[PDB]
Amino acid sequence: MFNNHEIDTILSTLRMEADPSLHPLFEQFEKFYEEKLWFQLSESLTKFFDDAKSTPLRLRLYDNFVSKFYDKINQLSVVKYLLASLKDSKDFDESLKYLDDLKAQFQELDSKKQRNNGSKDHGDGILLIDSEIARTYLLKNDLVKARDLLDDLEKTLDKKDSIPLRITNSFYSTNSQYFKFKNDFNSFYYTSLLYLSTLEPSTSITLAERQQLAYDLSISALLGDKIYNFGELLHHPIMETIVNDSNYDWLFQLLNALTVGDFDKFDSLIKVQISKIPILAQHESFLRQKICLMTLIETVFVKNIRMLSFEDISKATHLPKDNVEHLVMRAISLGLLKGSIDQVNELVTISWVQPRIISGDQITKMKDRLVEWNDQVEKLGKKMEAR
Amino acid sequence: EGKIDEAADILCELQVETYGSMEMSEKIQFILEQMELSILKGDYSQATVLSRKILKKTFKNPKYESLKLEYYNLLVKISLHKREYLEVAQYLQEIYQTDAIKSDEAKWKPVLSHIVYFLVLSPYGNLQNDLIHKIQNDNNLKKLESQESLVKLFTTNELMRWPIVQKTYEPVLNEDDLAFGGEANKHHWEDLQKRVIEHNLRVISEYYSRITLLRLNELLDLTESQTETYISDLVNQGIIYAKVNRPAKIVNFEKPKNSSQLLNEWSHNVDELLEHIETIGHLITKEEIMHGL
C-alpha cells in the first residue's frame, strides 16, 4: 500500500522545503520495509502513530533523518521514539549497535535547551546510555550482574528533579524485571502496580508494553500478596481497558477459588502448571489467611472489636486444629496485628488497626458506626448543657 | 624434641630485648612463635599480654596486611580456650577494611562468612543485626545471601526451624579453616541449639500474650524439665522476663500492669480521636465542593 510513502513524503516536504530532505531512496526504502497495514514511519507528528513496527534495517538511513528531524518538528519527538521502537521490534542486537552510535551526544552544550529523559521526551545524553544499558543487560545476563545495574539505575533516578517522569518509568520497568527474573512475585506485584500507575495517566503507551504489564500483573498477583488477594484488584485495573488479552478470566477465577479453597479449583483457576508456579506451594497458606481475615473483619461485630473465637477462625478458614495453630503463629509475625493474643484462654484478643477493603461494605458499616459515635457524643453534651 | 618450656624460655628473653628496635616484621614474628608455644602449656593469660602488645604494633606499621592476618590466627586460638565471640568478631571487623582496598574477593569472602556464622553460634542475636546491616553485606555474594536468609528465619522461628537448618546446610554449617582456627562439628551443634532455644522464647514473649506450658514443651520439642531451665536462665539474666503459674501449667509473658502506662495510653487515644476529627473535617468539606462541581 502507498500510505507510508504518501504520508512520510508529503509531511517531510511540508515541514522543510526540500534541502537534502526529501530523500527518494528513503521514500522507496521505507516503502520496501513496510507497505502492509503497519508502516515503518509516518513523519513528524505521525511518528507518534507509525515508527518501526518490524525490524528496521532502514536504520542507517534514519540516522541521516535524525540529522534532519529537529527542524521538521520539535524537542520531544526525537528522544521519544527510536530507542523503544528497536526494543518493541525485538531488535536486541541492533539496540546495542544504535547505543554505540548515539552514546551521549545529539545537540548538547551551547545548543542549549533543557533536557528530560528518553522514551517520552528529548533526554539526558547520559541517561539514555544508563537506562538502556540496564534494560538490555538484564535480559541478556545474570542476576548478580542485574543487582549491579540496578544500583546504577538507582543513582540516576536520585540525581534528578522528577519533572520529565520518563526516568521514573525507566526505574520501575528496570526494577520489575529483576523480580520477574528471580521468583519474587510479591515484590514484583508492588513494582508492577507502580509501573502501571505512572504509565497510564500520561499516555505514550504501546500495545507491546501494555501486554507485558497486564499479563505480568496477573501472574504476580496470584504468585504473591500481602494485602488481600482480589479486593484490591477491584480498585486496581487488571483489565479496565489496559488490554483484555491473555485470559484475564483468571482474576475472577481466583476470587472463586479463594472462597471455596478447592485444590481442583486451583488447577482450573489458570491452567495446571502455571497455577502451581512453584510460587503457590508457600503461597496457599498466606493467601488462605488473607480470605479468612477480611471476611471476619467486616462481619463479626459492627464496631470492629478485637475479640475472635479461635474456633470460628478455624471453621471459617477450613483447616485442622494443629495447622491453624501454625498459620496464626506465622500471621502475628507478619504484623498489622499486635496487642497480644492469649494462646491459652482461647482468646484471639489482638488489637484493631488494619485497613478495611473496598468502598462498598466499608460505607454500610460506616453509617451504622456513625449513628452510634454521634449518639454517644450527643448524650454527654445534653446532660452537660442542662445543668 | 618436646622441650616446650626450654624453647619458650630462650624465645622470651630474646623478643623483650629486641623490642622497640630491629624491624616491625621481625618483632611480630617472635610473638607468633611464642603464642604457639604458650597455648599448649596453658598459658592463655601470657598469650593475652602478648596480644595487647602485638595489636599496637600492627597498628603502628603501615603496610601490615600480612601482620594483621598472623595476629588473627593467634587470636582465635586463645579465644577457643576461653570462649568469646566478641574478641574474634571485633579484630576481624578491622581486617574487613584492609581486605577491600588491598585484596581480591577471594581473600575477603571466606572471612566475611566465617565472622557472621561465628555470630550465629553466639547466643544473643543483638550483635548479629549489626554485622548483617552492612552495605556491601546485604548485596550479593552467595554466602552473604545464605546468612541474611538465616537472619530473617530467626525472627519468624517457632523452633521447628532448627532441624530444617541443620539438614539443609552442611557447608555454612561445618565449614572452617578459612579465617579462623576451627572448631568441632559437634561443637557447632551445641551452640546452634542453645541459640535457637533462647530465640524461641524471645519471639514467643512478643507475639503471644499467653501460651500454656504443654504447648510450649511441644513447640521447642523438648522435655519440661529442660524447658523450665532454659526459661529460668533467661528470665534470671533479664534480657526478658516471663512468669510461670505452676499448677495451671501456663506461662504468663505478662501484659501492662501499671497506671503510668495506662494514663499515657489514654492520652494517646484522645490524640488519635482529635486528629480524625480534623482530617475528617477538611476531607468531607472537599468532597462537598466536587459534588457541587
XYZ file of C-alpha atoms in Angstrom, chain B residues 3-285:
283
model
C 61.190 -29.326 75.369
C 58.445 -26.768 75.141
C 59.446 -24.889 78.366
C 63.155 -24.594 77.256
C 62.373 -23.202 73.734
C 59.967 -20.662 75.231
C 62.493 -19.526 77.821
C 65.013 -18.710 75.163
C 62.422 -17.157 72.880
C 61.020 -14.865 75.817
C 64.371 -13.354 76.660
C 65.105 -12.568 73.000
C 61.943 -10.820 71.990
C 61.915 -8.465 75.096
C 65.469 -7.291 74.478
C 64.910 -6.854 70.788
C 61.609 -4.709 71.384
C 61.227 -1.174 70.123
C 64.042 -1.686 67.525
C 65.135 -4.202 64.742
C 62.238 -4.233 62.359
C 58.481 -4.330 62.878
C 58.075 -7.581 60.830
C 60.831 -9.297 62.843
C 59.391 -8.439 66.222
C 55.743 -9.504 65.331
C 57.222 -12.816 64.118
C 58.666 -13.797 67.514
C 55.392 -13.014 69.189
C 53.515 -15.570 66.847
C 56.034 -18.298 67.602
C 55.621 -17.503 71.304
C 51.865 -17.615 71.404
C 52.023 -21.010 69.556
C 54.109 -22.467 72.318
C 52.043 -20.683 75.058
C 48.748 -22.132 74.177
C 49.872 -25.748 74.609
C 51.297 -25.125 78.156
C 48.047 -23.468 79.449
C 49.445 -20.040 79.222
C 46.493 -18.256 77.969
C 46.967 -15.264 80.296
C 50.647 -14.830 78.956
C 49.146 -15.152 75.488
C 46.644 -12.259 76.266
C 49.501 -9.950 77.387
C 51.408 -10.779 74.137
C 48.183 -9.946 72.288
C 47.858 -6.389 73.645
C 51.474 -5.623 72.649
C 51.196 -7.031 69.001
C 47.873 -5.315 68.456
C 49.603 -1.851 68.969
C 52.463 -2.984 66.839
C 50.327 -3.937 63.773
C 48.522 -0.629 64.035
C 51.726 1.427 64.010
C 53.004 -0.171 60.981
C 51.848 0.966 57.543
C 51.543 -1.984 55.003
C 50.833 -4.696 57.511
C 48.170 -6.911 55.950
C 50.270 -9.991 56.428
C 50.954 -8.975 60.059
C 47.280 -8.480 60.939
C 46.322 -11.886 59.430
C 49.033 -13.608 61.554
C 47.723 -11.898 64.691
C 44.272 -13.162 63.799
C 45.490 -16.721 63.569
C 46.953 -16.485 67.105
C 43.946 -14.593 68.486
C 41.205 -17.079 67.666
C 43.142 -19.938 69.259
C 43.325 -18.252 72.733
C 39.559 -17.420 72.456
C 38.920 -21.150 71.869
C 40.182 -21.936 75.452
C 38.128 -19.001 76.912
C 35.011 -18.537 74.695
C 34.486 -15.008 73.414
C 32.859 -14.432 70.048
C 33.277 -10.625 70.761
C 37.127 -10.743 70.615
C 37.353 -12.635 67.447
C 34.455 -10.644 65.867
C 35.918 -7.110 66.520
C 39.534 -7.581 65.346
C 38.142 -9.270 62.162
C 35.923 -6.253 61.637
C 39.130 -4.035 61.306
C 40.534 -6.743 58.928
C 37.405 -6.218 56.713
C 38.575 -2.721 55.678
C 42.067 -3.850 54.793
C 40.695 -6.757 52.739
C 38.553 -4.454 50.465
C 41.371 -1.994 49.435
C 44.420 -4.415 49.134
C 42.951 -7.843 48.381
C 40.725 -9.909 45.988
C 37.135 -11.070 46.805
C 38.861 -14.485 47.149
C 40.602 -13.393 50.355
C 37.591 -11.384 51.618
C 34.532 -13.665 51.152
C 35.616 -16.697 53.375
C 36.447 -14.159 56.239
C 33.105 -12.336 55.988
C 31.277 -15.619 56.028
C 33.121 -17.053 58.997
C 32.545 -13.885 61.057
C 28.761 -13.844 60.561
C 28.467 -17.607 61.079
C 30.563 -17.188 64.361
C 27.876 -14.742 65.469
C 25.148 -17.302 64.607
C 26.562 -19.738 67.254
C 26.802 -16.812 69.622
C 23.732 -16.956 71.862
C 22.397 -13.334 71.748
C 21.102 -12.059 68.437
C 21.674 -8.447 69.126
C 25.262 -8.427 67.754
C 24.043 -10.188 64.571
C 21.993 -7.404 63.271
C 24.882 -5.017 63.200
C 27.113 -7.167 61.101
C 24.224 -8.073 58.648
C 23.084 -4.388 58.088
C 26.419 -3.601 56.247
C 26.016 -2.019 52.743
C 28.192 -4.486 50.852
C 26.975 -7.259 53.127
C 23.297 -7.004 52.099
C 24.035 -7.029 48.361
C 25.222 -10.104 46.511
C 27.810 -12.808 47.465
C 26.257 -16.356 47.698
C 27.285 -16.859 51.330
C 26.017 -13.341 52.110
C 22.562 -14.262 50.765
C 22.656 -17.604 52.787
C 23.406 -15.677 56.098
C 20.745 -12.936 55.590
C 18.060 -15.587 54.964
C 19.053 -17.162 58.284
C 18.746 -13.690 59.867
C 15.079 -13.494 58.652
C 14.462 -17.048 59.810
C 15.241 -16.319 63.424
C 12.623 -13.516 63.544
C 9.877 -15.878 62.436
C 11.145 -19.017 64.441
C 8.698 -21.257 66.111
C 11.593 -23.894 66.677
C 10.630 -26.488 64.190
C 13.178 -24.457 62.250
C 16.355 -25.972 63.818
C 16.425 -29.496 62.198
C 15.435 -27.654 58.942
C 18.526 -25.610 59.301
C 20.657 -28.485 60.500
C 19.879 -30.682 57.463
C 19.548 -28.063 54.713
C 23.013 -26.524 55.059
C 26.190 -28.652 55.569
C 28.808 -26.159 54.182
C 27.757 -22.927 56.014
C 27.222 -25.375 58.949
C 30.562 -27.245 59.249
C 32.959 -25.027 57.283
C 36.203 -23.939 58.954
C 39.906 -23.258 58.419
C 39.388 -20.115 56.304
C 39.954 -17.129 58.508
C 39.657 -18.917 61.854
C 41.474 -21.912 63.650
C 38.426 -24.239 63.510
C 36.071 -25.762 65.897
C 34.481 -29.304 66.185
C 31.362 -30.202 64.136
C 29.882 -31.420 67.343
C 30.570 -28.038 68.998
C 28.609 -26.345 66.223
C 25.539 -28.386 67.137
C 25.813 -27.424 70.921
C 25.928 -23.721 70.191
C 23.253 -23.565 67.477
C 20.904 -25.423 69.865
C 21.239 -23.017 72.763
C 20.886 -20.005 70.475
C 17.602 -21.215 68.942
C 16.074 -22.282 72.270
C 16.601 -18.822 73.686
C 15.245 -17.143 70.457
C 12.050 -19.113 70.552
C 11.326 -17.866 73.988
C 12.382 -14.339 72.830
C 9.825 -14.001 69.965
C 7.216 -16.028 71.849
C 7.067 -13.301 74.509
C 6.090 -10.613 71.962
C 3.821 -12.423 69.651
C 1.546 -14.235 72.085
C 0.212 -12.827 75.336
C -0.096 -16.306 76.987
C 0.838 -19.824 75.894
C 0.306 -22.910 78.004
C 3.409 -24.844 79.044
C 2.173 -28.121 77.463
C 2.070 -26.301 74.106
C 5.333 -24.618 74.687
C 7.123 -28.011 75.537
C 5.803 -29.305 72.227
C 6.945 -26.096 70.288
C 10.516 -26.322 71.495
C 10.115 -30.057 71.114
C 11.588 -30.569 74.496
C 11.250 -32.117 77.904
C 9.502 -29.951 80.560
C 12.497 -30.204 82.884
C 14.782 -28.574 80.346
C 12.249 -26.078 79.141
C 11.679 -24.851 82.698
C 15.553 -24.453 82.900
C 16.028 -22.716 79.547
C 13.301 -20.318 80.534
C 14.662 -19.883 84.070
C 18.130 -18.947 82.989
C 16.747 -16.338 80.522
C 14.340 -14.589 82.826
C 17.040 -14.514 85.536
C 19.578 -12.771 83.100
C 16.907 -10.137 82.425
C 17.082 -9.971 78.625
C 13.399 -10.630 79.036
C 11.059 -11.793 81.910
C 8.216 -14.305 81.952
C 6.455 -15.827 84.858
C 5.215 -19.363 85.418
C 1.953 -20.353 87.091
C 2.898 -23.919 88.013
C -0.477 -25.707 88.958
C -2.163 -24.432 85.731
C 0.906 -25.184 83.594
C 0.549 -21.746 82.000
C 3.381 -19.362 81.302
C 2.421 -15.757 81.537
C 4.609 -13.440 79.473
C 2.666 -10.675 81.476
C 0.826 -7.673 79.919
C 0.580 -3.952 81.031
C 0.498 -3.879 84.827
C 0.882 -0.218 85.905
C -1.136 3.085 85.970
C 1.694 5.128 84.357
C 1.302 3.149 81.116
C -2.499 3.436 81.172
C -2.567 7.215 81.634
C -0.224 7.741 78.676
C -2.112 5.159 76.549
C -5.350 7.064 77.253
C -3.914 10.458 76.320
C -2.813 8.793 73.109
C -6.277 7.536 72.389
C -7.660 11.021 72.718
C -4.890 12.353 70.451
C -5.993 9.965 67.680
C -9.687 10.892 68.021
C -8.825 14.537 67.723
C -6.705 14.084 64.591
C -9.500 12.098 62.979
C -11.953 14.884 63.569
C -9.737 17.444 61.754
C -8.806 15.054 58.847
C -12.491 14.182 58.532
C -13.449 17.884 58.705
C -11.271 19.077 55.776
C -11.813 15.819 53.862
C -15.601 15.953 53.915
C -15.511 19.708 53.008
